[PDB]
Coordinates of C-alpha atoms in Angstrom, one line a residue:
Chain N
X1 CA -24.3 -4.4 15.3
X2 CA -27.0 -6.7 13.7
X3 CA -30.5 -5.4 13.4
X4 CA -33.5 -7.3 15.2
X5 CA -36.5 -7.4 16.5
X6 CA -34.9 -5.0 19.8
X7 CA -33.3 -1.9 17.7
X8 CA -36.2 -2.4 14.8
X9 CA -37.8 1.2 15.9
X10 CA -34.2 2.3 14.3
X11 CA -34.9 2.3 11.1
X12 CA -37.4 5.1 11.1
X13 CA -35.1 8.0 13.0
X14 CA -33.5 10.8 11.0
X15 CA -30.5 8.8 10.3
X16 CA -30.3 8.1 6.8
X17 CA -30.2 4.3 5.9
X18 CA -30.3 1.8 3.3
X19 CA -31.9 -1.5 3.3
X20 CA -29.6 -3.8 0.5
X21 CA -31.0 -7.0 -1.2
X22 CA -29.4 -9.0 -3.1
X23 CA -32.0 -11.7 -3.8
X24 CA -32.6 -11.1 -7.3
X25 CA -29.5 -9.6 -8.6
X26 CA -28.3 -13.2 -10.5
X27 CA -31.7 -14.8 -11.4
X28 CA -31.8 -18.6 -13.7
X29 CA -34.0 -20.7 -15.3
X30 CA -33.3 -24.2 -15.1
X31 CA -33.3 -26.4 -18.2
X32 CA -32.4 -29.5 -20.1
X33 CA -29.6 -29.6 -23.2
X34 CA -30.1 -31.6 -26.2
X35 CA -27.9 -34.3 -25.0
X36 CA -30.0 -34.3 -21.6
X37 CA -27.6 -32.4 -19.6
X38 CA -28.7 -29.1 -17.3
X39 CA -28.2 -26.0 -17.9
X40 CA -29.2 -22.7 -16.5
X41 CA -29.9 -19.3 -18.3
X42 CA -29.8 -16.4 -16.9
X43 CA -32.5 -13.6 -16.9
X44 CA -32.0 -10.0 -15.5
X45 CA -32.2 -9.0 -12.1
X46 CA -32.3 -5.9 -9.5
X47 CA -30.4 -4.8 -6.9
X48 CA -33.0 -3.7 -4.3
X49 CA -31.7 -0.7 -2.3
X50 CA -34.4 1.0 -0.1
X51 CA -34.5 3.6 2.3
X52 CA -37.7 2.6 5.0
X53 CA -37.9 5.9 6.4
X54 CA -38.8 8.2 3.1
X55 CA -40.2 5.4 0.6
X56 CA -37.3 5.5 -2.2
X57 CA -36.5 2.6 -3.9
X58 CA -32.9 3.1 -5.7
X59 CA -33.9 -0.2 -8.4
X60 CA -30.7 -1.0 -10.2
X61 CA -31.5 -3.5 -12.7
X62 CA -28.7 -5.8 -13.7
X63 CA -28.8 -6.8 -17.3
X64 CA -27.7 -10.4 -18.4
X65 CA -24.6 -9.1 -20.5
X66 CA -23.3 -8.7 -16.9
X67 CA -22.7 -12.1 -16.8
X68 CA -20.7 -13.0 -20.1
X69 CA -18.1 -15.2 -19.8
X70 CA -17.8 -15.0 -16.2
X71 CA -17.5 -17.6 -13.6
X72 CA -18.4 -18.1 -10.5
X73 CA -21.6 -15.6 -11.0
X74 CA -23.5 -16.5 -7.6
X75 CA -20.0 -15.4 -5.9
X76 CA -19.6 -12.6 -8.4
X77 CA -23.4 -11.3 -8.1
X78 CA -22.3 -10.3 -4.3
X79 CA -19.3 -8.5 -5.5
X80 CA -21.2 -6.6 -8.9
X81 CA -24.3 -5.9 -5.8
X82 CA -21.6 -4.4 -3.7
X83 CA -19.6 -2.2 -6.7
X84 CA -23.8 -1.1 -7.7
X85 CA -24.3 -0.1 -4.1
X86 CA -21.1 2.0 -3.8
X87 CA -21.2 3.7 -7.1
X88 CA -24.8 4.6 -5.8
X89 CA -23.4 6.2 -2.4
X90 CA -20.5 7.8 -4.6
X91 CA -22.9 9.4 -6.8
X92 CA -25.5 11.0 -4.0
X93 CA -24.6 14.0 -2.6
X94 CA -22.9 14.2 0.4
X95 CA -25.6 14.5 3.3
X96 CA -28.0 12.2 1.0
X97 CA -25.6 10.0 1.9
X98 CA -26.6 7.1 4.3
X99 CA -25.2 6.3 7.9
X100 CA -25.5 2.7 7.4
X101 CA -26.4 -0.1 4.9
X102 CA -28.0 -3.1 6.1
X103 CA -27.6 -6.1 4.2
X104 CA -30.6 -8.8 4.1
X105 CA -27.8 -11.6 3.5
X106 CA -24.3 -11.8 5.7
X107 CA -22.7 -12.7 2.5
X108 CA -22.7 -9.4 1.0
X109 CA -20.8 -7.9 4.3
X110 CA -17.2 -8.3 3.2
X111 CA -17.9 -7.5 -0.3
X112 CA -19.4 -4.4 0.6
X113 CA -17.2 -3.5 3.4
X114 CA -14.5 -4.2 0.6
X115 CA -16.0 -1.6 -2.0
X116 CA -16.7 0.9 0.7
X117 CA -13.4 1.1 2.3
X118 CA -13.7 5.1 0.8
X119 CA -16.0 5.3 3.3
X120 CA -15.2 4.6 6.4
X121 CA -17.5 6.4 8.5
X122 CA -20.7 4.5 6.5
X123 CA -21.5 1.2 8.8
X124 CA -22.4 -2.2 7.2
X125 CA -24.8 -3.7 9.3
X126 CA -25.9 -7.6 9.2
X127 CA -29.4 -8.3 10.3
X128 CA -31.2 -10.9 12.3
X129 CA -34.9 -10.5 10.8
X130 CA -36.4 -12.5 7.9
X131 CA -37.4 -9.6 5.3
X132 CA -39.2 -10.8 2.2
X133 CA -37.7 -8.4 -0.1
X134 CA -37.1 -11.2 -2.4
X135 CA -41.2 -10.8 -3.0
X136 CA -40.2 -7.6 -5.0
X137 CA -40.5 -9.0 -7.9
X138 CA -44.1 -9.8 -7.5
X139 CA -44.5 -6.0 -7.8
X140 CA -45.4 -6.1 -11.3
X141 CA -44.5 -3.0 -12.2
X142 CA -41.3 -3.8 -10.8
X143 CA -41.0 -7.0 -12.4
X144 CA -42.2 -5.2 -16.0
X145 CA -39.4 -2.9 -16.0
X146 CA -36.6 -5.2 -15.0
X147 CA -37.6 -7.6 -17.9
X148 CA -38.1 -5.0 -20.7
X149 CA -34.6 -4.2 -20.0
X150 CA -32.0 -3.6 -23.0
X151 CA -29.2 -2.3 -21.1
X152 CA -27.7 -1.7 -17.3
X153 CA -30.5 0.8 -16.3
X154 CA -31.0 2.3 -12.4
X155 CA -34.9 2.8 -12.2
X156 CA -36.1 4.9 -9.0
X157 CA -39.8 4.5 -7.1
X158 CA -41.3 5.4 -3.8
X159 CA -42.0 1.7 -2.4
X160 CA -44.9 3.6 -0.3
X161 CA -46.9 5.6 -3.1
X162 CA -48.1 8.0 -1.1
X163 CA -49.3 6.7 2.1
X164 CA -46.5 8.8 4.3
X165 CA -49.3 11.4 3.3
X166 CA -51.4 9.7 5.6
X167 CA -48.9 7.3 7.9
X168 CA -45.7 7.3 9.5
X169 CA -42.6 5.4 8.0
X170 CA -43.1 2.2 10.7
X171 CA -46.6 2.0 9.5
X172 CA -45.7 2.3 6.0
X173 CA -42.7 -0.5 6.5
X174 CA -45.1 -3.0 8.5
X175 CA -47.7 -2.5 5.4
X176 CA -45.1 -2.9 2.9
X177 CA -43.5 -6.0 4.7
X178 CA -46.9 -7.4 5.1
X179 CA -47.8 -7.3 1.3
X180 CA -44.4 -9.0 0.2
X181 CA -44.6 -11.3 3.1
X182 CA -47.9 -12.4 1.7
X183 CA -46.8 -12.2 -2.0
X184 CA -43.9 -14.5 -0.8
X185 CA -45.9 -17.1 1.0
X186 CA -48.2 -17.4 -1.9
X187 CA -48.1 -15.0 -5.0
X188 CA -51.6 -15.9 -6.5
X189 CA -53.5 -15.5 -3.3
X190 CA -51.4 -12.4 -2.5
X191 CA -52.1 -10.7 -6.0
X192 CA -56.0 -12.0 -5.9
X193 CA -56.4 -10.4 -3.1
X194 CA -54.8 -7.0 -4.1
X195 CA -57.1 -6.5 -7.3
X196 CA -59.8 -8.5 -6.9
X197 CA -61.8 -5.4 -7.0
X198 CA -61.7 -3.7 -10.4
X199 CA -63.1 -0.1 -9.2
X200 CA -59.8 0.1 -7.3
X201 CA -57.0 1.2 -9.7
X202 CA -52.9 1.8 -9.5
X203 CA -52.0 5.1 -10.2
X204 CA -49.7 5.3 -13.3
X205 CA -47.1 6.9 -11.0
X206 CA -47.9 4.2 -8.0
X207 CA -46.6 0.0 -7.2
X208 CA -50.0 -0.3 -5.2
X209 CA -54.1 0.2 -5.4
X210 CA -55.3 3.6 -4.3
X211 CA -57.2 2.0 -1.5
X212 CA -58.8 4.3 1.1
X213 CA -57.6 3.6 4.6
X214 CA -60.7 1.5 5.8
X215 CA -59.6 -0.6 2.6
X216 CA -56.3 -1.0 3.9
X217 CA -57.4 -2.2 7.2
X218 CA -59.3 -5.2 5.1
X219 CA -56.6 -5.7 2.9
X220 CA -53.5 -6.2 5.6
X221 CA -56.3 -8.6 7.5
X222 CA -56.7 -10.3 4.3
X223 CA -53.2 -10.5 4.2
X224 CA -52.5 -12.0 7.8
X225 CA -55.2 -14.6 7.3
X226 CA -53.6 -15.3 4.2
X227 CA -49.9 -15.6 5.8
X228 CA -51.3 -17.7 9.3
X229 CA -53.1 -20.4 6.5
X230 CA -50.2 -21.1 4.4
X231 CA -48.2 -21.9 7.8
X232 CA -50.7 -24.4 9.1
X233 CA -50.5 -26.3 5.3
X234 CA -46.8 -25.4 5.4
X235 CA -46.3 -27.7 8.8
X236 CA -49.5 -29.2 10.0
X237 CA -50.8 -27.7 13.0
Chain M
X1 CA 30.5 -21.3 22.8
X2 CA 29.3 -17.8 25.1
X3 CA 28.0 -17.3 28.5
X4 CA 25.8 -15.6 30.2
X5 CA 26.2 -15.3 34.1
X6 CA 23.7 -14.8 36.8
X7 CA 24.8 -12.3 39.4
X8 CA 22.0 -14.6 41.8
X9 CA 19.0 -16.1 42.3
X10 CA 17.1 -14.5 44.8
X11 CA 13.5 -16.0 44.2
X12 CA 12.4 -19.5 43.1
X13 CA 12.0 -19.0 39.3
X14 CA 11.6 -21.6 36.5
X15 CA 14.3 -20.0 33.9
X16 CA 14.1 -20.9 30.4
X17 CA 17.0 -20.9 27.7
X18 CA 15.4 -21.1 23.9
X19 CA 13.1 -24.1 24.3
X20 CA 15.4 -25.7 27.3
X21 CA 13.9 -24.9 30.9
X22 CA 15.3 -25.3 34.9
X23 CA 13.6 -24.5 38.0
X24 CA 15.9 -22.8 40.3
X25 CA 14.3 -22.3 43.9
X26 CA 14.9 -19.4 46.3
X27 CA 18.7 -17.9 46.9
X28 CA 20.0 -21.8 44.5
X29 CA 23.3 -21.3 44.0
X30 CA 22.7 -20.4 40.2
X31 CA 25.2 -18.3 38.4
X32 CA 24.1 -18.8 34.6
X33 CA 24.4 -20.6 31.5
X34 CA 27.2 -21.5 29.7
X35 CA 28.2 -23.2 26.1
X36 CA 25.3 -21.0 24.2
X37 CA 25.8 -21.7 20.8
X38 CA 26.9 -18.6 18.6
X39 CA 25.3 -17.8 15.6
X40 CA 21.9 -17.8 16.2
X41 CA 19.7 -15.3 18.3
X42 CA 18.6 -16.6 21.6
X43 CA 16.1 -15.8 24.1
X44 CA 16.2 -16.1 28.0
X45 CA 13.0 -16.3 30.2
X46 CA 11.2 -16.2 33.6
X47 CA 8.1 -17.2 35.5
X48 CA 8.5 -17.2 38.5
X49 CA 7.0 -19.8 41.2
X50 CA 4.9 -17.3 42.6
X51 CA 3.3 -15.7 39.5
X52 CA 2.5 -18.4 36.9
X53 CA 1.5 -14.9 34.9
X54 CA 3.8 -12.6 33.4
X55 CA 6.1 -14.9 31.4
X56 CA 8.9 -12.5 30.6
X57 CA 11.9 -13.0 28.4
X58 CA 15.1 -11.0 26.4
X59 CA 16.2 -11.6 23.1
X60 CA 20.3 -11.4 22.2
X61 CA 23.3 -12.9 20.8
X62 CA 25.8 -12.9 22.3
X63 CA 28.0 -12.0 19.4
X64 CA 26.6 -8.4 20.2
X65 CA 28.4 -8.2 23.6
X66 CA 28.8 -9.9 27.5
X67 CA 25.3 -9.6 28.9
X68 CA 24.6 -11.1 32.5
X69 CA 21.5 -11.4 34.5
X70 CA 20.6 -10.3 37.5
X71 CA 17.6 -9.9 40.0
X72 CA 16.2 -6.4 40.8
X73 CA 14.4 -6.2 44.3
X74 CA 12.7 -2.8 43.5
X75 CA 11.1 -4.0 40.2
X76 CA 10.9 -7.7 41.6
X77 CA 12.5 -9.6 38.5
X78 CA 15.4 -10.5 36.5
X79 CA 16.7 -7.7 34.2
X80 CA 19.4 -8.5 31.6
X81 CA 22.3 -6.0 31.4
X82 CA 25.5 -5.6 29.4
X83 CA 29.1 -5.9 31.2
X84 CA 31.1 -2.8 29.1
X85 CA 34.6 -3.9 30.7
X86 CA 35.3 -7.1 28.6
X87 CA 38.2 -8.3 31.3
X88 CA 35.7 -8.2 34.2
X89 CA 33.4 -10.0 32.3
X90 CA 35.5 -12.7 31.6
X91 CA 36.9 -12.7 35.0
X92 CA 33.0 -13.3 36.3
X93 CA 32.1 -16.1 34.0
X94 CA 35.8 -18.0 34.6
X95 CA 35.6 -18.1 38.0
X96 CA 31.9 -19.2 38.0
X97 CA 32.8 -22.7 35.8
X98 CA 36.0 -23.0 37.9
X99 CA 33.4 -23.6 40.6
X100 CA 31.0 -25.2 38.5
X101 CA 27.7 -23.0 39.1
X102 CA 26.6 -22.9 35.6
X103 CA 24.5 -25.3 33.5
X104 CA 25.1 -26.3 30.3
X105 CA 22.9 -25.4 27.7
X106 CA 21.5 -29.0 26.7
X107 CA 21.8 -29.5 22.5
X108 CA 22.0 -32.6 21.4
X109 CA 24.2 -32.7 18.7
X110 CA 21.7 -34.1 16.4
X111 CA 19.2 -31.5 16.5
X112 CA 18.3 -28.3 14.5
X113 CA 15.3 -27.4 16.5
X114 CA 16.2 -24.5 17.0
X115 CA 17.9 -23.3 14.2
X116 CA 14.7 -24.1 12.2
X117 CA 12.3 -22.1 15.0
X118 CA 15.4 -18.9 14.3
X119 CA 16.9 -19.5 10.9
X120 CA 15.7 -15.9 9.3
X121 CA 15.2 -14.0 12.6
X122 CA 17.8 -11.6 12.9
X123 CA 18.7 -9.6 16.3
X124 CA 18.9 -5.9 14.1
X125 CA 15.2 -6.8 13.1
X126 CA 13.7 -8.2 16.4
X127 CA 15.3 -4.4 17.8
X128 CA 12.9 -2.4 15.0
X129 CA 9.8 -4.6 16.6
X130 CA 11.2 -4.1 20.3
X131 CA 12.2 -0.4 20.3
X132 CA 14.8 0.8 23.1
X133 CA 17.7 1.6 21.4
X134 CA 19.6 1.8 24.6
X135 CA 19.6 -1.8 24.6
X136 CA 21.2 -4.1 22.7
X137 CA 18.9 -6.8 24.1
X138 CA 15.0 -7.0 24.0
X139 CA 12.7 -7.1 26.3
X140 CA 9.3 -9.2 25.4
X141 CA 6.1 -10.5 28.1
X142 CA 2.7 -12.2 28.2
X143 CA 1.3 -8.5 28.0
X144 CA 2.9 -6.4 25.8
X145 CA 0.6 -5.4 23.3
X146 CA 1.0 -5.0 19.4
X147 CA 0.4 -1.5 17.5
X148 CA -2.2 -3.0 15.5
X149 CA -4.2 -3.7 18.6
X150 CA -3.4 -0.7 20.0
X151 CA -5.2 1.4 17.2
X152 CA -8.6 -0.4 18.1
X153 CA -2.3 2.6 24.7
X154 CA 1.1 3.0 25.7
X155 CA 4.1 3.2 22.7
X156 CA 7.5 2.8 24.4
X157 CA 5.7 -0.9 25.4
X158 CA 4.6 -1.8 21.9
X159 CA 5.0 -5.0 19.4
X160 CA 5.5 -3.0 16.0
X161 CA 4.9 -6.0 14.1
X162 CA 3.8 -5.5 10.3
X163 CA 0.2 -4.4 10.2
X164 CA -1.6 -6.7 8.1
X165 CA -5.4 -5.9 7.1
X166 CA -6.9 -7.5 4.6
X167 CA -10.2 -5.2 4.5
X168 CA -8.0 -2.1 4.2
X169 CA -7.0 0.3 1.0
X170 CA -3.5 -0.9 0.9
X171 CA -4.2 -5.0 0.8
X172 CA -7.1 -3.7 -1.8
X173 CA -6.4 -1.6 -5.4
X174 CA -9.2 0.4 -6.3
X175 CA -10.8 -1.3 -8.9
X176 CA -9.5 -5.1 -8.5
X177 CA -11.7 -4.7 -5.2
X178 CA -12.7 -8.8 -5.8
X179 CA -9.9 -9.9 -7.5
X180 CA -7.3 -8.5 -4.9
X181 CA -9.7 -10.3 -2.2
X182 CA -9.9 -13.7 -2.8
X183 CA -6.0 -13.3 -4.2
X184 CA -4.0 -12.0 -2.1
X185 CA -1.1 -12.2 -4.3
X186 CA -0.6 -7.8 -5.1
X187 CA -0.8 -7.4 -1.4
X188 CA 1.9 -10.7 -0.3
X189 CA 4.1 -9.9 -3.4
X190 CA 4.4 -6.1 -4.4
X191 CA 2.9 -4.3 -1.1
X192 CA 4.5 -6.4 1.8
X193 CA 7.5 -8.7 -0.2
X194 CA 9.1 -5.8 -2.3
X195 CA 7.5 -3.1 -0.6
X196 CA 7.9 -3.4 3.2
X197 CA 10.0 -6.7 3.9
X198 CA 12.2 -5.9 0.5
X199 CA 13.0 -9.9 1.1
X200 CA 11.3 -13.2 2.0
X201 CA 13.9 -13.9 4.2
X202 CA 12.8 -10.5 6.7
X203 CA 9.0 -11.5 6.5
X204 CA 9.7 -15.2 7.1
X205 CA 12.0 -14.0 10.5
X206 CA 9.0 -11.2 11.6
X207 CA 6.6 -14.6 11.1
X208 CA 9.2 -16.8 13.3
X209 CA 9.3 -14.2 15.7
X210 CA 6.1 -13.6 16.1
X211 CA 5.7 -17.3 17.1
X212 CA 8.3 -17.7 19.2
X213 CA 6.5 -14.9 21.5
X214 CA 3.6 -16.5 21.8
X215 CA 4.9 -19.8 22.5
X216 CA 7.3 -18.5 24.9
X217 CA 5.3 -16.0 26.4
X218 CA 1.5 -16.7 25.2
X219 CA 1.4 -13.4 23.9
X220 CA -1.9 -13.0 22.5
X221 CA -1.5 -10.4 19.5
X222 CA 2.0 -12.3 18.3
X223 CA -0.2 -15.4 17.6
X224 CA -2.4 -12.9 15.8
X225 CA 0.4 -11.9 13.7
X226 CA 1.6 -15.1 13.2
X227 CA -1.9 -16.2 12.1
X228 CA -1.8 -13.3 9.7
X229 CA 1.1 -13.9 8.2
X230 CA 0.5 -17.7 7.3
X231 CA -3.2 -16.5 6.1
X232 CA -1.3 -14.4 3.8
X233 CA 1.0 -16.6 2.1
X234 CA -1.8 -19.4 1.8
X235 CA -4.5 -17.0 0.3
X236 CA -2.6 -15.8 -2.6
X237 CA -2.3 -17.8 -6.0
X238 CA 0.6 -16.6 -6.8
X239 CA 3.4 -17.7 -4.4
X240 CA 7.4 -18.0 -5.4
X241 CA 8.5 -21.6 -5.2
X242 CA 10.8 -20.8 -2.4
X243 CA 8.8 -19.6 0.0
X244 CA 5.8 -22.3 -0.3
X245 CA 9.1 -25.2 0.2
X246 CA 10.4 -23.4 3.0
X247 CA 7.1 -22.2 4.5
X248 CA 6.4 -25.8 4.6
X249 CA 9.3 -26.5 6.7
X250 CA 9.3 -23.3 9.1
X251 CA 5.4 -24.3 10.1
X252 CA 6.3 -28.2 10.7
X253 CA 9.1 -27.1 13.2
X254 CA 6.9 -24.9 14.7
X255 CA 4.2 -26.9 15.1
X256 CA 6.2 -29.8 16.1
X257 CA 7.8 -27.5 18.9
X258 CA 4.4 -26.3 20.4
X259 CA 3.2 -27.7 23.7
X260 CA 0.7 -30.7 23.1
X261 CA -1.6 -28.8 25.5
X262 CA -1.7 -25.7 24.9
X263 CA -3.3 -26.3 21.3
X264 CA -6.6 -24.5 22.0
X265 CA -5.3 -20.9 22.6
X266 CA -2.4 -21.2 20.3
X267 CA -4.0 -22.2 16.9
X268 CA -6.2 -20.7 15.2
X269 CA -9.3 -23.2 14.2
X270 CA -10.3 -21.3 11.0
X271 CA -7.1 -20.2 9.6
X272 CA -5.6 -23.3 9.6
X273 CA -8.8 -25.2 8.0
X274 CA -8.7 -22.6 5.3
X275 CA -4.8 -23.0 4.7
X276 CA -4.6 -26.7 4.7
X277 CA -7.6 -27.4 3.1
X278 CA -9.0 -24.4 1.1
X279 CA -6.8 -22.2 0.0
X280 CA -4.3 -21.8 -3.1
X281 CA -1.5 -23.9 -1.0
X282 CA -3.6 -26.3 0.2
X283 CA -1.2 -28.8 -1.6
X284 CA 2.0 -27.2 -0.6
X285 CA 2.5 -27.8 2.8
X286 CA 2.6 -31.8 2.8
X287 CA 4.7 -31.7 5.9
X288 CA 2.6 -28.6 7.7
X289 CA -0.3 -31.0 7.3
X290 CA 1.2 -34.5 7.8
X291 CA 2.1 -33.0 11.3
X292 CA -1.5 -31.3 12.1
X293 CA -3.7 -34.3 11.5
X294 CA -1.2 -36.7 13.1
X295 CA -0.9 -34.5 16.5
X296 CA -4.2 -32.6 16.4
X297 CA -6.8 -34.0 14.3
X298 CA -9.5 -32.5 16.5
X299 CA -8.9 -28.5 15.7
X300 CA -9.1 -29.7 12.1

């Protein structure tokens, strides 16, 4: 079934799953031609595959030679997503696995379902909830590596650094959904907010500031008084 | 022109011959139906006045032998059976339209109704979907269920219509996952046409008879293979000539045929939007569509 706000704890048992989102995967710029016609060109993009219970992002980057001479590229984006996604489960070991993929979009479910057919025991689950994972690409470091580039390149991370040192995977999902929230509503607030503070630095081998937990608890209030503001400007109240 | 008697009528019953019907109440004098046109399969079917569920029906031709109705007071309906002695049979159905106790089965001369509903279904074939080989008749009801909605109980009662899947390895080639999705033309063409069917002519009859069962009998998984089959044809670009002409005029008889009110359980909303109006074929079933918008604009 479809994953909400009921079966949410879900996500953090010892079933291995995958989050899937397809946001980014066929990204444009918009743009006038000489004779004052639009265009679009196309930049690369990511598959964004992430397990919330251990952390690890599976960051398949999808270079712009993807797209020559093909049509249709937002309907074949879903398909390339869904081909990315089961070479990924093809090439894991058998109990790494996952259970079940949840897509972020219902319009990835049949072309998924389609390229997993050698796996029919692996359930493709629609959800109900809003998840910003579209924000990943204000992770600069995630946004760095899929502009630099050259070729078709899968690029792994631990989405939590290391705060499952310290808190359990829902903590560590409601942080991380927090921050891109935020980053989504508004991206120069969001990033102000995150470095404002020089002293506190990002590990070379981290997405996010080495903040001790009391800074945490300032920064996700900084970040709900960020989100509830935008709303009132959003629609007046 | 063939017969088939009626032994009695014990209970009031509304008896239907093809797409003619007759109520006939309690112990009527009613002893059968003569002047059945040869050459075509037929089907003969019951609801009786008490039970407005369980429509129930056989399919024959009569070409295949003398078969007679008649009621069964243990199993409380009307069985068809086969008369082996070929003089007692004829001796039966004489001396019933000396006397006069048989109607007439109604064509007007100037219609091919039902040879267009029937024109590829083909008794040996309708036996393969109906197994009891004892038979040479077949049994069909509202209830019976198919083997494709079986797999998600009982076999010797099952519709083993043509599984169609299009999320499944054999409508999908490894590798042409999206091409062999949106174009449905390797499964229509290589896998069902010269795999399973061999012919158009045995998948066009499976499709008509799959129809004919839910019209008839409001079977729920024939209309689900009809559906299928139709969905099939529409959603693949590449389509022999033939088949899109005569497609064209199988649906238009069939639609033309359906009851005006039983349109909501009958046809299915999205696949016929996506045939008529956004698949490959959109533009090949002027007639099929003609007829929907001028009889049921609202579904569309």
């Amino acid at each position: 079934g479809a994953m909400n706000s009921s079966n949410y704890a879900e996500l953090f048992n010892n079933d291995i799953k995958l989050f899937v989102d397809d946001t980014n995967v066929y990204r444009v710029t918009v743009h006038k031609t000489f004779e004052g016609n639009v265009a679009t060109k196309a930049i690369n993009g990511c598959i964004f595959t992430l397990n919330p219970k251990t952390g690890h992002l599976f960051l398949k980057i999808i270079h712009t030679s993807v797209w020559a001479g093909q049509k249709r590229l937002s309907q074949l984006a879903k398909w390339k997503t869904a081909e990315e996604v089961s070479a990924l489960v093809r090439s894991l070991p058998k109990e790494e696995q996952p259970k079940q993929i949840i897509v972020t979009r219902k319009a990835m479910l049949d072309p998924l379902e389609v390229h997993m057919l050698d796996f029919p025991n692996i359930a493709i689950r629609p959800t109900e909830l809003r998840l910003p994972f579209s924000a990943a690409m204000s992770i600069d470091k995630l946004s760095d590596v899929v502009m630099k580039a050259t070729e078709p390149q899968m690029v792994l991370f631990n989405i939590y650094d290391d705060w499952l040192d310290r808190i359990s995977s829902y903590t560590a999902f409601s942080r991380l959904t927090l921050l891109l929230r935020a980053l989504k509503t508004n991206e120069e607030s969001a990033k102000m907010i995150l470095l404002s503070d020089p002293t506190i630095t990002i590990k070379s081998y981290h997405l996010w500031p080495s903040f001790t937990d009391e800074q945490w608890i300032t920064i996700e209030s900084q970040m709900r008084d960020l989100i509830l503001t935008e709303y009132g400007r959003k629609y007046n109240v | 022109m063939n017969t088939v008697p009626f032994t009695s009528a014990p209970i009031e019953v509304t008896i239907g011959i093809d797409q003619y019907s007759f109520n006939v109440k309690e112990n009527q004098p009613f002893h059968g139906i003569k002047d059945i046109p040869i050459g075509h399969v037929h089907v003969i079917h019951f609801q009786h006045a008490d039970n407005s569920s369980m429509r129930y029906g056989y399919w024959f031709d009569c070409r295949m032998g003398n078969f007679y109705i008649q009621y069964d007071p243990k199993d409380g309906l009307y069985k068809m059976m086969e008369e082996r002695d070929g003089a007692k049979f004829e001796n039966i159905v004489h001396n019933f339209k000396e006397r006069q106790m048989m109607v007439s089965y109604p064509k007007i001369d100037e219609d091919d109704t039902w040879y267009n509903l029937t024109e590829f279904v083909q008794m040996d074939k309708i036996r393969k979907i109906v197994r009891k080989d004892e038979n040479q008749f077949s049994y069909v009801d509202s209830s019976m269920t198919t083997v494709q909605e079986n797999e998600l109980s009982d076999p010797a009662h099952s519709l083993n219509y043509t599984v169609i899947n299009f999320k499944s390895r054999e409508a999908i080639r490894p590798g042409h996952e999206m091409e062999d999705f949106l174009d449905k033309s390797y499964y229509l063409n290589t896998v069902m046409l010269q795999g399973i069917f061999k012919n158009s002519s045995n998948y066009f009859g499976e499709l008509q008879f799959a129809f004919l069962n839910a019209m008839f009998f409001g079977n729920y998984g024939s209309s689900l293979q009809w559906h299928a089959m139709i969905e099939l044809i529409c959603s693949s670009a590449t389509v022999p000539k033939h088949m899109l002409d005569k497609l064209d005029e199988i649906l238009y008889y069939q639609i033309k045929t359906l009851p005006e009110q039983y349109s909501d359980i009958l046809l299915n909303e999205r696949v016929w939007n996506i045939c008529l109006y956004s698949s490959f074929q959109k533009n090949s079933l002027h007639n099929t569509e003609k007829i929907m918008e001028n009889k049921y604009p609202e579904l569309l």
